[PDB]
Design a binder for this molecule. Structure first.
Ligand SMILES: [Ca+2]
Ligand SMILES: [Ca+2]
Ligand SMILES: [Ca+2]
Ligand SMILES: [Ca+2]
Ligand SMILES: [Ca+2]
Ligand SMILES: [Ca+2]
Ligand SMILES: [Ca+2]
Ligand SMILES: [Ca+2]
Ligand SMILES: [Cl-]
Ligand SMILES: [Cl-]
Ligand SMILES: [Cl-]
Ligand SMILES: [Cl-]
Ligand SMILES: [Cl-]
Ligand SMILES: [Cl-]
Lengths: 136, 136, 136, 136, 136, 136
């Protein structure tokens, strides 16, 4: 089966909800740099960053290796609470299996996003890998 | 026969239409980053990004390999629909035959473009290849 | 004979006018990104971008390779007419002999310039080569 | 025992306080480029910049090497004093042992950050190192 | 004899005046991107851009190679006259001997600067080389 | 003996004052790009740009090579006076010894800065090198 990008995104979100029942996990249309959490719990936004596709490796078939980029951004008022939450995410997400992916979820980087509206924001960037197989 | 750039983008556009009838496919002058869809349907803007020409290869004839960049950008309110739509562009367009091109259409990258006017925007960037042959 | 830059630009313009009698061809002081055509004919602006000089090949003579960059930008109202216009330039200019240059004209790239003042703009970037020979 | 990022920041801050009792050391949600100190002392803001994770090294297990970036920014009215305090930060933090890290704290770079609100600002960027080990 | 930077600039300026008596040659404090001449004669602004010094060759003496950058910008109302003038500078300056320099003046690049206040502007970038020898 | 950054800045300053008594030499918190001198004397601003520390060279001792960047900026009304003063800086500063540094002062580059407030500005960028040794 081919990968459905949204399913990969939901897998990350659901694993996070299961291991962290007291976190508000969203897949939002709003950028995490500015997003305002409404709940009384630690808030994490899941975002699909994009993909880079490698050329077909000298093959008759249009088959391409795809590297998927996904971010999870913690948004909480205190700096210390944001850093603790960040440790929870990587411990929750590093190495999990993703559907229709050819290897586990890998950690790429963590970065400070900002402090807009008095919420401290830190992002964990991750990568997944899959094979795009063109219709014939 | 020499490649007609407009024919290549019409092929990409026609292919998308036949496979995705509820999509509103445009070849526009406005940048997909700021374009505001009129109406409610899923919107896709097809755009010819340009070409890079390799040097002739130590020969008497002026023959140049040409790499053609084309983008298809989804523009919709909900990000879940944007991602679903991007999956549809990808299986519709990957590996298709293009008139007077050297190889099938190849996928290059997918990227989040933005959320201007509250429309989530995702672009699928693709490449075509042809051989430019100078007149003698 | 030393290469006369304006003569090279003139060769491009003339060639273009002879093969495209209904195009309005200019060597203007105004940037093609902002230029607004006075008529309804397909308009092309020809421009000298600059040169890069290679350092002398370490000989008792100060002789330097020079790579001239030249743009031709089509300025037309509809996006599809712009694309068709680019095709005409490529076919017209690719591989022509330029006066006092070491080789034919080579294509370099095609890029979307923009859509200011209701005119779609595409540029064809080209290169020419000559030997700068310093005086005694 | 996996690393707790906040512990690493606390260790750097505590080390600084103990060796520099006249300094005002914070772990703030405010960027050190703009922060306006409320006092006459030497103010130092500690910040967790982020991390980069190397790929697992051809191993079945998801084990990733983590490089942690941390800054300590001095904020002092006169430059002479900012430079002196910067020297003190080096001497205090360079080569120290950090909890659950696989090597001592390393210095990376120092840079002038600005003079906002008439307080000279220099940052000391440092790196810590640890091994991220995915839960199986 | 140590190189006097101003003497190099003066040599370039004087050489230009002698071979081009109708040009107006200046060494100005104003950037040639914005300078506005009164009148429509060919104006040329000479400017010392800066130098790059190579590390001493790991020998017992602090001896550093110095690559000097100098620009000559033509400021002319009509584009075709700006190009003819640019050809004139290159023929006048390419290969000339400069006081206390270890080699002739070399051309580096030609670049379109802009069309501010209705004057076309092209810069000819050139390099000179000398040997900086440290005192004791 | 550990390297004291302010002391290196002072040595540069003092060396300049001894060889150039009519220059007004400062260590200021104002960026030499906008600083407005009062008086007729040639003004030079000395600034500590920052440092880069190389990793400890495969040793079990935190010892790190430090490359220090320092700028000296000439601020003078006339272009020719600024250029002459730049020559005086380079002749005064190149290759002098610095306290607790492992080699002489090296010139890196010279750059034109700007002409703000009718003062022509040029900077000489230099590097010192030292060895940072961590406390046990
Ligand atoms: Ca819950
Ligand atoms: Ca291949
Ligand atoms: Ca339809
Ligand atoms: Ca005609
Ligand atoms: Ca205290
Ligand atoms: Ca003479
Ligand atoms: Ca005259
Ligand atoms: Ca002395
Ligand atoms: Cl929880
Ligand atoms: Cl559909
Ligand atoms: Cl025509
Ligand atoms: Cl203290
Ligand atoms: Cl003349
Ligand atoms: Cl003096």
């Amino acid at each position: 089966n081919a990968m459905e990008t949204l399913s990969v995104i939901h897998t990350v979100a659901n694993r996070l909800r299961e291991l962290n029942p007291d976190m508000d996990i969203h897949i939002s249309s709003t950028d995490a740099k500015v997003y305002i959490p409404t709940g009384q719990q630690v808030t994490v936004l899941i975002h699909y960053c994009g993909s880079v596709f490698a050329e077909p490796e000298n093959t008759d078939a249009t088959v391409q290796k795809q590297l998927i980029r996904i971010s999870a951004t913690v948004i909480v008022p205190q700096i210390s609470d944001a850093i603790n939450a960040l440790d929870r995410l990587r411990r929750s997400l590093g190495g999990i299996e993703l559907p229709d992916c050819d290897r586990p979820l890998w950690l790429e980087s963590e970065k400070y996003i900002g402090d807009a509206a008095n919420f401290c924001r830190y992002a964990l960037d991750m990568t997944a890998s899959t094979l795009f197989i063109a219709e014939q």
